[PDB]
């Protein structure tokens, strides 16, 4: 059935990008999380959505000092060891790197999750995603897009495209199924806008409402 | 004869990316300038390398703000004008933008830069690409890389490829000329590694001193 994601957990129960949040969604009993992450200084990736922190960019702070000043940030192995608990669940990491610092992240991201199951990478970063398939060739990649440039889409060695659900239309995923791309909108948190893209097939959805996602599929 | 480009202008001779900077680059006998523009919060083309001010980031700053603050920084109109002066010269624009704002920024710089002769836009992020070339199909553009990301190339409606001169070998070349692409590569300041890129059959170069650029060619 269609994947229910929750995005950056369960943002409404605890806060967003945080192991209670993530725990809270799969105890929901939804199939799966997307987390954004960002680089430190000394190469971990930080589960938080801004860039921007009380102590500068995430690139210029060790990881150390950035959980001393916000003691809730996650580091991106704590919130994949959650598949201990939850053997099924899957998840969706959103790599977020200044575009021109994505590759050298890339390459380490693509390191760290060498081997990995039940993971894919996704970026809005073409160049990201290049390098991240150059270096692990067996991790499942995703194409973030904010506007259509599904013309990439034939340079990039993607499994899956991540559309804004605002760009999800039939004549769309016609071109998506055409080339066999698993398609995972974001970030649906209605229900009239969840059954119009379910209705058109996709593989999958994020969201900040387990709620609304739970009834979809089967 | 392959384009000798001067990078920023005559960088060594006033400061980059300034009237005097372009001028004296033009005076010097090149075909042309590479000029670095960030859109100011009012969409005015700021010519500067850097995107942080002492004011902060370039898109949060209006324009005439920053020419209070910085006098000597130009908007792209003013560097375009000289092509009054020295009419056979030609001006690689390089729009940066912040990946996410580089659509909208692309598109802004599309109709400023509608009909316009002797220009050609170059960007490292391919959305910005995508964006310009739907929103300006006459406009010629180029394609920069710091790593070798050839790999898009047929997604990306460009005429150019601006690999950085380190990505520059004869396999590299031949697999761009087998597309039909004008091949510009940047920064190039030393007479042996100028003489390496030319025997190699480059279109162009782009470089901070002038003097060793003059002589390439015929």
């Not at 680089?39 to 702070?61: E, K, M, N, S, Y």
């Not at 580091?75 to 575009?99: D, I, Y």
Request: glycine fraction near 10%; charged fraction near 25%; aromatic fraction near 6%.
């Amino acid at each position: 059935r269609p994947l229910r994601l929750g995005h950056r957990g369960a943002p409404l129960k605890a806060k967003e990008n945080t192991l209670e949040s993530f725990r809270l969604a799969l105890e929901a009993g939804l199939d799966g999380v997307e987390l954004d992450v960002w680089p430190t200084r000394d190469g971990v990736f930080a589960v938080r959505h801004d860039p921007d922190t009380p102590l500068g960019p995430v690139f210029q702070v060790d990881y150390a000092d950035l959980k001393a000043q916000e003691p809730d940030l996650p580091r991106l192995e704590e919130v994949l060891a959650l598949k201990e608990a939850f053997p099924q669940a899957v998840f969706n990491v959103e790599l977020k790197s200044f575009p021109g610092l994505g590759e050298e992240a890339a390459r380490r991201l693509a390191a760290l999750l060498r081997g990995r199951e039940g993971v894919w990478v996704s970026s809005f970063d073409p160049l990201a995603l290049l390098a991240l398939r150059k270096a692990a060739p067996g991790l499942p990649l995703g194409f973030l897009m904010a506007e259509d440039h599904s013309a990439l889409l034939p340079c990039l060695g993607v499994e899956a495209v991540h559309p804004h659900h605002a760009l999800v239309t039939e004549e769309a995923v016609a071109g998506w199924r055409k080339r066999g791309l698993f398609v995972v909108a974001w970030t649906v948190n209605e229900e009239g806008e969840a059954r119009r893209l379910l209705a058109l097939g996709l593989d999958g959805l994020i969201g900040d409402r387990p709620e609304v996602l739970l009834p979809l599929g089967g």
